[model samples]
Target: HTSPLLAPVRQIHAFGDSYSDNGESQRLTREMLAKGIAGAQALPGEVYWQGRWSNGPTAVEVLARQLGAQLADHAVGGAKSGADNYYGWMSAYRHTGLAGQVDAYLATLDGKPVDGQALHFIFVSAADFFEHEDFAGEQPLEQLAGSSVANIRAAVQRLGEAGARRFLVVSSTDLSVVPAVVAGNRVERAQRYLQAVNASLPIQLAALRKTRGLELSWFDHLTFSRHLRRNPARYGLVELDAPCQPTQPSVRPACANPDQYYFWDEWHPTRRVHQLAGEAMAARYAR
Candidate 1:
């Protein structure tokens, strides 16, 4: 029997931050493909015109390929880019607006009705972007909490109103698990902020879902991150904080085998990590 509520997945519109950008891997793949080389390596901060970071694909790409869905990406890096701050770990409470992007996308299909059976909207966002910046004097926890929840609520509303039925929201991972946060003297502060941001997500999601008739799923980045950090040796990863490649004092190093590590840089997770996260999210669709 065909279920009216169950939409056949066809077109997937993805919106989010650099993690969704597949930045590193996309860059590396283009370089390799262009040079007729199989495995291309990137020196630290080397420019790849294609705009990707490395060899593997991003989470959205992986998920789309697995689901056989047509994919469109509107993710970029910078302040106000997505739900998360461009720094990767820190949250940017004031800059989580997706109005411009959602409006543009909706305009494309304004009069045309989306084939419900074939169209699915997946939003992979709300990471470091919706928290306190902490650049100047310490901000009050109350302010951070209020701002974070408000930003998330706003983002979810914009997406849902634009006709996104199947929504997937990737929760903020524990920043303490990242190299910079763990190694830095400000570990306590980072850990606290990470915990606060993640804890606030469920509340924000619940409110948004209640108001908007959209199916929203949360990806638990914290759990998977803990597993990887605790079992780094199992994944053949030497370091969890930095990448394997040599980086400047300002930039954190890459992991020895990024495929094994959950984090690629101080702010982003590795392709392998994204693969795991994507699979977890796919499991929701399966159910």
Candidate 2:
């Protein structure tokens, strides 16, 4: 595959959900954002490192750190592809969707020319399925996949129109292997939906790249997860199936060797996994 690096990456602007969120959602109160009263939240030194959904920095944050690049992340935990609140149990905590994130990001530019050397990311589609799995009686998986792909394409188009050139479109991991999905007894359906999205997204993005004249990168998270699962020891991991901290109404104590585990919570990966992912992604831009 051709690399997406058109220039050396010095800035990273990300738009997505929890996987890419570095506490932006937790820091900015929903009410505050609703009224344009923006305030940044400090990543508190606690279990969820700096209010990141994970126990430590997310992969995107790690990548930025490794590349010594400045980052402006608009990803919010529980975000979806559309402009609706998160689904099922977490619907009350209002998070901006992908469209809103793009708008918020563009607003910060103040009509300045976007940096071609900066890398932009869109990683929000998974939540639309993972969150929806909490409850049923919704759109068909095929329809959901098409809708989600279209929404992502819209985000890319908006950013491209705003003069952003480079993009890393992240594919969702296999939710069939996720502990939460397994516990929810929706493995079969989750796999089906994930397949649909994973299959349709790249084709759509390729079409967009040709028409819009953009440098696009695809992070095949599903394949990455498969590699990690196939040989945890290769990545210095031992625990693959079980999460380091079992997710519950009351947060359970974490495992002693969290670094050896693949997943930290029912939904997110441990710090080690994110670190490894950062290294792998940054390698793509190596000279």
Candidate 2 lDDT at 130 equals 71
CA displacement after TM-score superposition, residue 191 of candidate 2 (Å): 0.9
lDDT of 2 by residue, 1-287 (tens): 76465445788998888788887766655444455543423222245777787888888888888877888888887678976435322334443789878877777778788787778878877778875666553888889888898999999999898888899888877778778888888899888888999999999999999998898888888888889989888778998878888756556788999899988887888888888887767766642
Q: Which segments of model 1 are wrong by more than 4 Å?
A: 1-8, 23-50, 53-55, 79-97, 110-134, 233-238, 250-256
Model 1 TM-score is 0.71
Clashing pairs in 2: 43-50
| lDDT of each candidate versus the true structure | 0.54, 0.78
lDDT per residue for candidate 1 within 1-287, as digits (tens), equals 63333333566776665556545334433454566553333322452213533335667777677666787765544323243333432221122224434555667785775444433333333333233443443666545545655565676676566556666666655655555555555566656665676788777787777777667666677786777678878766665665544333554434445566555655556667667666655655542
Candidate 2 matches the true fold with a TM-score of 0.89
Question: How large is the C-alpha RMSD of every model relative to the true structure?
Answer: 7.7, 3.8
lDDT leader:
2
Which stretches of candidate 2 lie above 4 Å from their native place? 1-6, 30-46, 87-95
